Design a protein around this ligand. Structure first.
Ligand code: 4KO
Length: 159
């Protein structure tokens, strides 16, 4: 996979908003969103957040991420990670995580990245583990059905 990155642009929003395939996938990456996802919801997040970035391969936008918390000299928290359904498990998330780590270090002088992952997303938990993130706490949250879920709060020093 040859991959590149650039800041997200308005022209990318229809594409990226197409990435979540079901209510679960949307909840794992943007729990405040309501199904069905839309460009308006995506743009609302982008406006409130920082560092919205896309990953590109062979002319296709395949991934997106941003920060929902950022604290200069301290840490950032990574969210809205979305990957195109045809490109799952091909290293797009791993690549974007690395890009966002660099951006947190370089731009925000962060010493730490925080990643919070919902308990049902095994693939996320195992990826973040492979990338050196360790679990620190578990917090209660609720899903759209009012069911209790566990948010596993992980972090990694940036160096
Ligand atoms: C403020 O904190 C968040 N919200 C909550 O705790 C509330 S929940 C119940 C509701 N509604 C936030 O906003 N978060 C996000 C996100 O990006 O929207 C995520 C998604 S985490 C994620 N997505 N892709 N990669 N990653 C790491 C994990 S909960 C965390």
């Amino acid at each position: 996979m040859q991959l590149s990155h650039r800041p997200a642009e308005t022209g990318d929003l229809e594409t990226v908003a197409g990435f979540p395939q079901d209510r679960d996938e949307l909840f794992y990456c943007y729990p405040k969103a309501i199904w069905p996802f839309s460009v308006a919801q995506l743009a609302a997040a982008i406006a409130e957040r920082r560092g919205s970035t896309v990953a590109v391969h062979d002319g296709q936008v395949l991934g997106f991420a941003n920060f929902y918390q950022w604290q200069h000299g301290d840490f950032c928290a990574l969210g809205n990670m979305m990957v195109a359904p045809a490109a799952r498990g091909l290293g797009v998330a791993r690549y974007l995580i690395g890009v966002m780590e660099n951006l947190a270090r370089e731009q925000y002088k962060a010493r730490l990245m925080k990643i919070s992952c919902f308990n049902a997303n095994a693939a996320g938990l195992l990826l973040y583990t492979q990338l050196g993130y360790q679990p620190r706490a578990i917090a209660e949250r609720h899903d759209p059905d009012g069911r209790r879920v566990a948010l596993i709060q992980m972090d990694k020093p940036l160096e």
